[PDB]
Amino acid sequence: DVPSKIGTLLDLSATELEQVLYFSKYIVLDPKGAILNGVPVEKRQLLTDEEYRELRYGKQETYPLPPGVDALVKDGEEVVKGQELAPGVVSRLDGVALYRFPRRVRVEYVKEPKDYRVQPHMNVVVPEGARVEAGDKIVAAIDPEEEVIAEAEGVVHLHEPASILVVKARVYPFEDDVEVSTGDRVAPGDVLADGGKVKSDVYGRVEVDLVRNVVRVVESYDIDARMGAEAIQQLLKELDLEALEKELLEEMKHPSRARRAKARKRLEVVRAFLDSGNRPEWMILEAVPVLPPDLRPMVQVDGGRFATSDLNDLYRRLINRNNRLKKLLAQGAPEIIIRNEKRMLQEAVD
Amino acid sequence: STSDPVRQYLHEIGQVPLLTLEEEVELARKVEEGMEAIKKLSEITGLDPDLIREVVRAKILGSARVLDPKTVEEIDQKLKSLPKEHKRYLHIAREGEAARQHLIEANLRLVVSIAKKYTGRGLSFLDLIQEGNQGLIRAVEKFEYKRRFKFSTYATWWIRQAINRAIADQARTIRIPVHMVETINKLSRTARQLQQELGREPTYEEIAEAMGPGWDAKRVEETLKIAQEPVSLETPIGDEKDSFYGDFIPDEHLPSPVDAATQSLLSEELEKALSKLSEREAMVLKLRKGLIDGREHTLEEVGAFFGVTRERIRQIENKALRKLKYHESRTRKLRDFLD
DNA sequence: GCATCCGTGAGTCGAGGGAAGCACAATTTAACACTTTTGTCAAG
DNA sequence: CTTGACAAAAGTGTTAAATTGTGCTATACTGGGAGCCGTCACGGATGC
C-alpha cells in the first residue's frame, strides 16, 4: 500500500523492502566487525547474496587442471592474484593452494621412485612428503585388492591433481589434539590446539584437516544478516517511537521544504502508532487467523455435487507450505531450500 | 527475475557448480563416514544417536539457525572433552555433516529436471520442486557409494517418489487416500485406451471388464462419483461478471421464518393441551418426552424424580396420554401440526 | 519538471448458466455374540 | 400403587476384514515455458 507503512517507519524504499521481504538481499543486523571491500559494515546495510557469502564464508575458487598436466605449485603453498597454478591456469585470488584429487602418488623408497595411479573411487590417506613405514596404508579403496600400500620406508609425493583449490585462510600446523573442530567460528587469540600454543590470528571459520594435521581458519566474519519478515520484524521491534519522534521533529525545522515535507509524512505514521497504542511489529504476522467455516462453506448441492469457496484453496496452500517448511527445518536442509520455502510461504500469505 | 519466483530460484541453484565423478564420490564417502562416526560417538558417550546428530548439525549450520542453544553448547563441550582417539570421530562427524549439505546443494538441478514433467497435475512448479527436494534429502541419507552407481541413478527414484506422493496427498480439496488415487488413475488410463479403440466413450461395463476381477459396472460408477472435484462457489455464470454459483444455492440449515413460527405455534398449543392434564400427569409426559430437560427420561429415571415405581409411571403416562387423545377428538385443534 | 505505479469507470431485470505398483504395518470399521437396561404383561 | 417374569432394545467386548499410511525401487539422467497489443484512458500520488 503506497507509501508502505513498514517502509516509512524503517526508512526503506519500496524496492529495498521487497528485496528483503522476498529473499533477494540481506539486511545487516549486527556487523560483528565485518569489513566489506575495506569499508566496515554498518547496521541496516543491504547485502547481496554474493556479498553475504564473501563475508560469512570467505573467498575460495577451484581451478580444474587439464588431465595429465602437473601443477607448477605445491600442496599448501600460498599464492598471489594472477600467479600461475598450473601450466594453463592462473589463479584470481591469493591464498593457500590445496591439491583436490591427486591422480598419482610417487612414493620414494630407500634401498626407487615408484608411481601409483589413483582412480575416482580411491582416496589418498596420507599427506604429501610423509615418511610411511613399510606396511602403512597409502591409498585407500573400496576393494582391499586394489588398496595401495608401501613395500618399505619412503616419502609420498602427490602429483597430477584434478584441480587446485585456492582458499583465503590461515594454516596452523599442530601436533597434539585440536581444541576446536570443523565449523567453529573463532576470533584472534582463540586457542586452536596444543593447549593454547596455537591461536587464531584472524576471524574466520575453522576447518581441521586430519590428513594434513593442520587447522585452516577460513577468513570470514560472523555477520548477522537476515532476509524476509524475520529480519524486518527484528528491526520493527527495536524502533523507539519516542526517540524517533524527536529526531523527526528536529528534522522538521530544516530550511529545505522537501526535507520538511518528508519528515512530516514519516512523523504522521509515528504519531499514529504512539497515540493508537499499536506496536509497529504487529504488521508482521506470526499467527494467521482462519475464517469460520460457515463463511467459507463446503456445501453439498441438491445434485450431490460439492461446492466450496476459494478461501479454502488459499488456506490449504498456506497450510501445505507451512507444514513443509517445518519438516525441512527439522531435516537441517540447506539454506537454498529453506529460503525458497520461506519465500513461497510469504507469497502464500500474500 | 524478482517478480518471477521460478527464475529467481533457478538463478540461485545455478550458483552451485555441478559435482564431478571424483567430487561426488568424496562427498558421499564423507557422508557415510560421518554417519558411522556418529554411531561410535553414541556408543562412547551413551548419548542418543539422534541427539548427537542434531548437535553436530546445529554447529555446522551455525548461529544463523534458530533443544535450546544452552543444551547444544553443553553437549558440544562434553564431546570436546573426550580423549584424543575419541575426539577424532567428532571431527569426522563434523566433516560428514558439512559434506551432506554440499551434496544436497549440488543436485538441486536434478530435482528441477525431474519436476518439470509433473506440472498440470494439481501442484504448481515450485510446489513440485520442494516436494522433490525432500526426496533428494532422503536419497542422500540412503545412498551407498560402495555399489559404484552414480548418484542420479539412485536419487531419481526418491525424487520422483516424493513428487508423485505429494500430488496424491495435496492435489485435491477433498483428500483421497493414496490407494484410491492409484485406482482412480488406473481407471482413467483404462478408459482412455478403450476409448481410443472403440471409437467412442466406453460404458461402465467395458471399463469394469477391462479393469479385471473384482470390478463391476456399479463399482466403476462409484469410483467416478468419488473422484469428482468440488466446484468453486465464485465461478462466474454468463458474460457479465456479476453472477456466481453461490448466488443460486439456498441455505438449508437455519430454519425459515415459517418453520420457526410453526414450531412455536405447536409448542404453544401443546402447552395449553397439557394444562388440562393433572399436575403430575402433565409433568410425567413433559419428562418422558423430554419437554423439560430436552432429553427423554426412562421410566426408572423418571421414577427417581417422583419416588414412584417404574411400573406406576408407565400407567399414569399411558392414562395421561389417553386423556389427551380424548380432548383432541373434541376440538381437533392439534391435528394440523402432524402433517 | 518528468517518470512510474495504482485505482476508477449507473441501476434493476433476465434467461442462460453448474500421469507407477507393490509389500507391509496401522488404523478404522463391521460382524457377532453375549450382558445390562427398558418397556411391558399380569397380577395383588 | 406395588412385584415377577417376560422379550426386545440398547450397550459392551472381541475379532476378522476393509481400509488407510508409510517406505522403497541402484545404468545414467542435473536451469521452466508460456506468451505475445485496438496493450484503456485519466488523474492522483510518489520518487526523482
Curated annotation (Swiss-Prot), chain A:
Q: How does it assemble?
A: The RNAP catalytic core consists of 2 alpha, 1 beta, 1 beta' and 1 omega subunit. When a sigma factor is associated with the core the holoenzyme is formed, which can initiate transcription.
* Highest taxon in the source lineage: Bacteria
Hey, which family's this protein in? Answer: Belongs to the RNA polymerase beta' chain family.
Q: Which residues cross the membrane?
A: none
Q: What is this protein called?
A: DNA-directed RNA polymerase subunit beta'
Function of this protein?
DNA-dependent RNA polymerase catalyzes the transcription of DNA into RNA using the four ribonucleoside triphosphates as substrates.
